[PDB]
Design a protein around this ligand. Sequence first.
Ligand SMILES: [Cl-]
Lengths: 329, 332, 330, 332
Amino acid sequence: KYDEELIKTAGTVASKGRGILAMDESNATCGKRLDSIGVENTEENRRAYRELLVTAPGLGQYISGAILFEETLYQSTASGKKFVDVMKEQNIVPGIKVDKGLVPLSNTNGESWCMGLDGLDKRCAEYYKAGARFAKWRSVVSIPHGPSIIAARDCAYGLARYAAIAQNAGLVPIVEPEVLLDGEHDIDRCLEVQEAIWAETFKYMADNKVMFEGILLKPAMVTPGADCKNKAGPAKVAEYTLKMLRRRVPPAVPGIMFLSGGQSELESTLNLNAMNQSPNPWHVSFSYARALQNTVLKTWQGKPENVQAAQAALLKRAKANSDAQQGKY
Amino acid sequence: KYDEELIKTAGTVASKGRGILAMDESNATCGKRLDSIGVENTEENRRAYRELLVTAPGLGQYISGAILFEETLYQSTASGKKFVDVMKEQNIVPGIKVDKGLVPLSNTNGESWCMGLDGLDKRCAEYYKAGARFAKWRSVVSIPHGPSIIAARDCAYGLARYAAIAQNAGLVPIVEPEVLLDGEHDIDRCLEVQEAIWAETFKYMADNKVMFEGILLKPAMVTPGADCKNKAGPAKVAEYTLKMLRRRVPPAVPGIMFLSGGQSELESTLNLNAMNQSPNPWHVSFSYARALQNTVLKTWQGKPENVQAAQAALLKRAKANSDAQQGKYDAT
Amino acid sequence: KYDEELIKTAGTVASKGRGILAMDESNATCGKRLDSIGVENTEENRRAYRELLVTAPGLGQYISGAILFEETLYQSTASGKKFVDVMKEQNIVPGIKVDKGLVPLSNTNGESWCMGLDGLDKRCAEYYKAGARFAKWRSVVSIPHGPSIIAARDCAYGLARYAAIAQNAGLVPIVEPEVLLDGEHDIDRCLEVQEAIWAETFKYMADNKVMFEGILLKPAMVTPGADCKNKAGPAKVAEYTLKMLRRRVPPAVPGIMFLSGGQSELESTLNLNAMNQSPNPWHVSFSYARALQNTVLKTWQGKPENVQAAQAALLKRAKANSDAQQGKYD
Amino acid sequence: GKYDEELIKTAGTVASKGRGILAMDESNATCGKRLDSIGVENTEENRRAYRELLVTAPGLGQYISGAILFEETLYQSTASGKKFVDVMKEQNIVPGIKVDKGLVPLSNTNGESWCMGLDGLDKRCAEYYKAGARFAKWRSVVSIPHGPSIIAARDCAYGLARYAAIAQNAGLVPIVEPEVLLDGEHDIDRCLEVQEAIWAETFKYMADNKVMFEGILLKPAMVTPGADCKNKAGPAKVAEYTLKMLRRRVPPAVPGIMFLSGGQSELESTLNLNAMNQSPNPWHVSFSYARALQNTVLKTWQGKPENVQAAQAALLKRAKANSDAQQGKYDA
Ligand SMILES: [Cl-]
């Protein structure tokens, strides 16, 4: 039923030279991010900071969509313009986070699972009425923990169950099984684990009859572990990540937007840039949170007189990644 | 952390000549029961009924556990002593339904899945503090619908997830993948579907490292469909059901407490009785709702003068199924 | 060790404007072919007929590989030089059928499974010594039987086992889970069963660490059932087939060479040509047996005087399908 | 024609109280090594004479219910001319046959094996049935030092379950042997975990394949520490761990469980089995030994015809000891 709509949303978000701005922090997380610049965590300050982001001048050139938190999806500018309505003209599609976060998985050794399927069909339905057109759900696997068979299983199984519920409510599911950076593992181990979790996630989605034309992928890049002494330059990170994707994603999938996951901003930019010297079977873009935002918070410093310079910092980094999306950096 | 208590609780519930009184009706559903006897669905009427059940004078000889609704777990008698404190003085284990019900499963043709995992760890911890010691979670499969691959998968997967979450919270999980009566299927088709869903549920439970010595099962018996041509008496249903169990339940599982699911009060007792003519590798007993308490509602009729006769009817139907648990049922 | 050469071979076989000629008939099956044109099934008439195919003068222009039977891989021309050397001179890669055929699967109601894993590692190692560079293994699923869970499972499980064995022996595996035409099923049901069996096959192949850059696919096209009323033009088989391939095959797979399987010598060309109107993420071509061989059989009639006209009949229908690989066919 | 009733009868005959299986299915190469150990030439006649010695031991049938034969021995006769199958029929011993084709490196694993044999297995078992065989054997393995890997464990479970359905359809009761190897330093807990997983997997695939559990036999390794583990395990602990594993994974429909020795002394093999039979079990827990029954026979025979009766006495002494251990009455 939503088939035409889902394919349309996915194509808009998977546009050339455009990526996603992730802004779906919890009220508490946005609070910890606001006190880094000494700003009190009120609903007005969160609303003001979110308005600052969505009204940045030329965002729509480099940002095709924005992942909002539930509170922000209903908020408006001080002018009175609904936030989703401001995004619509910069041709930025409104998305929202729908998972309920990570919880200890029983009978593992410190591994996590992502909850949120209870009531998810109703919640996604209301988010669709409110203007949201794609969803986001993040689950993780830990190489230092294996991952175990059952932890990798629930990450992939939960995602495929979520992808079907999201599409049936009119929301393009973003499928994020994040292979975490934790550990000393080399790039070959992360390639192995990425190939396994994607093969497993895609198998369950096929089982659930998810329409691949109407989904987007948010993977981590194939990189060595955070504590691995053997590092990897942008050329290697590009070669290892592209072969992984070519081995696991069918061409029916329109877009693939990487997470930063603890890289630089420049590393996140060079690595993406090194992947777009050639054509790709799908749109290989970006979907960053801190990588696009940390420049803005410390430039803004809560002072309304620094708003324009902060919104300018947002565009400098959003354009730098759009330059990378086309290899023009 | 709770391993030995789970084993101790499972052995008290799956004890000789005892079974479970399923009392976990919704506020809405318990209202339907009360309307069937012309009693208005108020909180005091529901509380009065639940007090009538758990305060029946001799229930501890035949009932080993009672599945409570979340509201009932915290209620007390009119005299002011707690239900769970009533049950323990009769060596009845308080249990709690912890699932959040059935919901259409996306991209199937009318099939449902059972939700409730979100926050389940915290709810079971609170139910444990309140004195509950076992839990219940009901998922279903429909033979008219197949069931489909992904529907049976989620029935087994969700139950195995729930079983691990409950054991880590200290609640013995009752595992209920009910194969529904609906359809025209014969008893061979029901046995085939039962064997598949139990093989899938036990594989996932093994994967999740569930401790089989601390679980209880609540299957449907192996019967022909509700709308099936040929029918099966107590001896054939006992034969088909025991075959299913012998082929799929490992001996470490201490107890198997069946649901009635749409048979008469008498049929439920006779089927259970026919399964206990010879010893079994596990305790084969009952977990009955509409069977055990149907006669209590009609004897009560909401009238305080009928309280004692309604409790006597409960003990009589409880004593029948306890006799059936030992293959000693005398229907005279 | 064979990683680099497997990638080269898969690219050579997946060249553009080229497909594979399947000539892997058993001695008994090929004898059935010669009896239909009144020819006696001896080893020399089989060798003579296979020489007629391998020695067609232009062949190596529309044909990149040829699937051989185990006997033909070792026999030479009348001159005395090995058939495998003719193929290399024509830039055609020698292939080899490596399965041991279909057998009833236990506890199914009439479903089959494909034998061959026993000794396969040693069998492929010697075929590589004999100059073969790719392999073929055909398993089936039957919509009229479901297919059942365990029947589809073994089809995908065996193919993924074989693919890993063939690669470690140096042969590019051709992966052929054939969804049979049998039954009255429509195109949507064939679409559903095709998507399932390929999801299962690729999952197992991923578990087995099969290198997707060095494999080839031989699927059945997405069509209604042989006994189904609603037909399908080249336009809609093309869009049903390509959407299923795009929903299941990862871009790393170099080539997809289809089987004709009882369509028509005409229809096989129209369908393939319709799938090459636009660029594809992989080389979508043809792997045909009778659609290239049958008019060769009936023109040769076993008489040596018609060798030239029968070899010409081979090339004429080869180019018809090669032009279909380019979307440029009359 | 359907063998369901004969399969059940065979399985119950082979899994009979006080009896176990003599495994004597060594290949010509392997039995040659055995004959060399006592310094005897590996001729076809010496293999036939050693096999005659074992099968013809007087009264062996009181302790041995079945004998796994190699393909060659299944068709051989005594020197006087009586077929070995007829000797075993007079001895009340069921003939069985090894049907797998040995271990082979599994592709893309780091040094792991799989067991081949499915090709032609249906015809082979059909011919073995006509020759008198009534049960079959298939040995697959998993390495703990290698994990085992997911695909190595999968093929072991998957091939066994496929072989079990083929065998039953041909009239042979399948002995299901996924051996967890002794290799490594792993402790008994790691063995337990790997045993539990491979049996959960093997039983799932078999349930999928509609294998009839009433007509199969199991041949597991015991649950013991690895060969190089520094923490050991006496008979009581081996029994506790092994029976827990079986209770948690083997459905009661399975009639018999016949352990391999796989690297234990004769005495510890007997004491381990004896410790598992101090109380009743839901299935017959017995033995399926090769070297633990044969090594003293070869060492006593020495190839010399004058030592035949002393070698047969040696076989009977060991078979009786394990038959006693099966009843728990070895020490007493
Ligand atoms: Cl260890």
